[PDB]
Design a protein around this ligand. Structure first.
Ligand code: DLP
Ligand SMILES: *[C@@H]1O[C@H](CO[C@@H]2O[C@@H](C)[C@@H](O)[C@@H](O)[C@@H]2O)[C@@H](O[C@@H]2O[C@H](CO)[C@@H](O[C@H]3O[C@H](CO)[C@@H](O)[C@H](O)[C@@H]3O)[C@H](O)[C@H]2NC(C)=O)[C@H](O)[C@H]1NC(C)=O
Ligand code: 2OB
Ligand code: 2OB
Ligand code: 0RP
Ligand code: CL
Length: 472
């Protein structure tokens, strides 16, 4: 099989195995969210006549899930089995001897219902209006025990039988009907939340990415897989341009999470970043002097003194992209070809002596990315600089000046821009909470036409507990 998408997400069986340690927390929440209506009636009891009854204020007093197991059913669903969910309900039994009025006043007995259940939830994943929706219509319950215990162990003779016959049955059906409904709601609440957080991560101000599905998610016995548009949105405008082709053969099934990114995404990124006016840098006096030092060169050297030079607190440097950067995914790395305008101004007392140069050039950099210790790291594999139009805006100019300014662009400009770049993406991910998760041995892999993120993750316990508590 083959798929049309700009971005692809693959969650494998090892990821589901780690997430299965939290299934009980979700199932517990489902029981805790359900609304059990009162069970009332009036039947003629053996030798007693009409007895009007009611099981009121049914609340859970104890819950315990023994173990859960998850299985991927190819082309069908995600099958979760929950064994031995020990439930204890409490409430009030209220009755009256309608016909046998001689038997005294109406009663109110506090009871406990001790039940053991085995569950089977088979969740189907579908594309609903761009987003993944979850539907579990195959939700099953198997009861191991369903015992009533009344305060003081009271028994007139009609209670146990009315509970064994009649009541037992309806209660089993009320429970399944509520529990399954709640599992489906919590399940969709999670899906919705995960997708909202994923869309938040892939956005900054007027820039966002359209992660709308291209088809229903894929279920194999090895993995779960979802295919996304990946079209960039700018100021609430997007274009439904034909999608690249994804091959499920390109991805593995060993790591917990595999992310596929077409190079069109990086191209579409560069376009919006350029148009939003983000691709510019400006350095003033002190900041400019600090940058030169930061790149292993002492400020009070001779070289500096002749040109940077007149007044260090008055020196200006501006870099802006002339046109949109051309990004390409290669086996060797991410290759970025950017047409830049570097402007240098070193004002002197008399505006004649000031050195004013404008370097209009094309810089090609081959980058390699890394993530570790909750930071993004960009390293330079190779580069090429071709000056298109170097210009001097004063009589204060020579070839040695042009060389010092050009060496500055190469030896300081390239490492600093990459340094600032890594900081920005690190801040974005941090602010969007990517650092909250424990990302284990991640690998950024560049290939011809695409990039690949392969990772194992440590699911953070308390954050789910927090989210689960935050419902109504
Ligand atoms: C764009 C990548 C290509 C970069 C290569 C460009 C070639 C170099 C060309 C010219 C050099 C001059 C400009 C470089 C210097 C500026 C570098 C920089 O400092 O910053 C890059 C810039 C934001 O500069 P600024 O003036 O707005 O802020 C300034 C920050 N200060 C307030 C602290 C001062 O532009 C951005 O970063 C744009 C990125 C925004 C991304 C947000 C969209 C959401 C998508 C992904 C992010 C989430 C991570 C998941 C990954 C999914 C894969 C897409
Ligand atoms: C930019 O700098 C030019 C000179 O600097 C250097 O020029 C190259 C040789 C090279 O080393 C390069 O790296 C540097 O940029 C300035 O050009 C000079 O301007 C002078 C004044 O106009 C000029 O002089 C005389 O030129 C003719 C012929 O001799 C006379 O008829 C005239 O009256 C001038 O007195 C000099 O020759 C000229 N040099 C060149 C190579 O053109 C240039 O003006 C300056 N730009 C700005 C905007 O000021
Ligand atoms: C650039 C991008 C880089 C971002 C890196 C972020 C790292 C995140 C790590 C991280 O923790 O990723 C996990 C995010 C949650 C999820 C998607 C996942 C695994 C399994 C998924 C779940 C399987 C079934 C679940 C349904 C709601 C049905 C449950 C029924 C049951 C009876 C309770 C479903 C789809 C919920 C979401 C998870 C991976
Ligand atoms: C004294 C100084 C004065 C002189 C004036 C200065 C003159 C300078 C002029 C020009 C300099 C221009 C040269 C620099 C060119 C830019 C080079 C340059 O660094 O370009 C890079 C920009 C970032 C990026 C798009 C890239 C490649 C890899 C991308 C990344 C791959 C994965 C990354 C995910 C966010 C991480 C997922 C991790 C997961 C949680 C496990 C992702 C998408 C982040 C962004 C990069 C190329
Ligand atoms: C940290 C917040 O983000 C996330 O947790 N993820 C994320 C991140 C990037 C992208 C990507 F690739 F498009 F850029 C998509 C997604 C999410 N996602 C896909 C997805 C896949 C399945 C799958 F495989 F099982 F079918 C199920 C679900 C969900 F939400 F229903 F549970 C979501 C997404 O946002 O889809 C629109 C899934 C999730 C994977 C860690
Ligand atoms: Cl009694």
């Amino acid at each position: 099989t083959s798929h049309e998408a700009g971005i692809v997400c693959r969650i494998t069986k090892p990821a589901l195995l780690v997430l299965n340690h939290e299934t009980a927390k979700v199932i517990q929440t489902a029981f805790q969210r359900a609304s059990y209506p009162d069970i009332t009636g009036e039947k003629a009891m053996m030798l007693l006549g009409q007895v009007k009854y009611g099981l009121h204020n049914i609340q859970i007093s104890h819950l315990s899930i023994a173990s859960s197991q998850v299985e991927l059913v190819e082309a069908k669903s995600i099958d979760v089995s929950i064994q031995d969910v020990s439930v204890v309900f409490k409430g009030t039994l209220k009755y009256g001897y309608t016909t046998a009025w001689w038997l005294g006043i109406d009663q109110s007995i506090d009871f406990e219902i001790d039940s053991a259940i085995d569950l089977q939830i088979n969740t189907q994943l579908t594309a609903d209006s761009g987003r993944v929706r979850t539907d579990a219509p195959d939700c099953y319950l198997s009861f191991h025990k369903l015992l009533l215990h009344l305060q003081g162990e009271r028994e007139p003779g009609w209670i146990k039988q009315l509970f064994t016959n009649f009541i037992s049955f309806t209660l089993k059906l009320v429970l399944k009907g509520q529990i399954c409904k709640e599992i489906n709601v919590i399940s969709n609440i999670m899906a919705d939340f995960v997708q909202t957080r994923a869309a938040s991560i892939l956005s900054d101000g007027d820039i966002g990415v359209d992660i709308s599905l291209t088809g229903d998610p894929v279920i194999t016995a090895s993995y779960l897989e979802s295919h996304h548009k990946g079209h960039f949105i700018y100021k609430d405008v997007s274009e439904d341009l034909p999608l690249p082709t994804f091959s499920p053969t390109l991805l593995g099934d060993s790591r917990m999470l595999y992310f596929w990114f077409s190079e069109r995404v990086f191209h579409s990124l560069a376009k919006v970043a350029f148009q939003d006016g983000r691709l510019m840098l400006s350095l003033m006096g002190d900041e400019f002097k600090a940058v030169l030092e930061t790149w292993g060169f002492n400020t009070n050297q001779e070289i500096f003194q002749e040109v940077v030079g007149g007044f260090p607190s008055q020196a200006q440097v501006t870099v802006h992209c002339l046109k949109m950067p051309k990004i390409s995914c290669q086996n060797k790395g991410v290759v970025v070809d950017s047409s830049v305008m570097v402007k240098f101004l070193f004002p002197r007392p008399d505006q004649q002596h000031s050195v004013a140069y404008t370097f209009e050039e094309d810089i090609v950099t081959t980058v390699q990315a890394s993530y570790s210790k909750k930071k993004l790291f960009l390293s330079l594999l190779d580069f090429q600089i071709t000056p298109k139009t170097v210009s001097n805006l004063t009589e204060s100019s020579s070839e040695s000046i042009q060389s010092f300014l050009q060496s500055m662009i190469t030896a300081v400009g390239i490492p600093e821009v990459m340094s600032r770049l890594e900081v920005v993406f690190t801040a974005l991910m941090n602010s969007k909470g990517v650092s909250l998760f424990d990302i284990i041995n991640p690998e950024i892999i560049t290939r011809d036409g695409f990039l690949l993120l392969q990772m194992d993750f440590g699911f953070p316990e308390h954050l789910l507990v927090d989210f689960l508590q935050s419902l109504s």
